Nucleic acid binder design. Structure first.
Length: 58
DNA sequence: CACTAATTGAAGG
DNA sequence: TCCTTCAATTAGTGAC
């Protein structure tokens, strides 16, 4: 498997507000956004995926 | 347990 | 036959 990534409180604030701006990223956006935070595209993809789930639960 | 990152796996492209 | 999405699942950390 793979260890949980400990996102920073700052990465997490960015991810949250990016998600507040739009809950989906296009590929280019994601490529850009992940580089901006120094996280892998997969990390961001999965964080958005998981957050969309949480947001559906609520 | 709550929360959340990661896995898996189907349906759609 | 790579990749997205969602649904469900698995599992790490951490409160109670």
């Amino acid at each position: 498997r793979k260890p949980r990534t400990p996102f920073t409180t700052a990465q997490l604030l960015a991810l949250e507000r990016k998600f507040r701006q739009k809950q989906y990223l296009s590929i280019a956006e994601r490529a850009e956004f992940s580089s901006s935070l120094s996280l892998t595209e997969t990390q961001v993809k999965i964080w958005f995926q998981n957050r969309r789930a949480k947001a559906k639960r609520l």
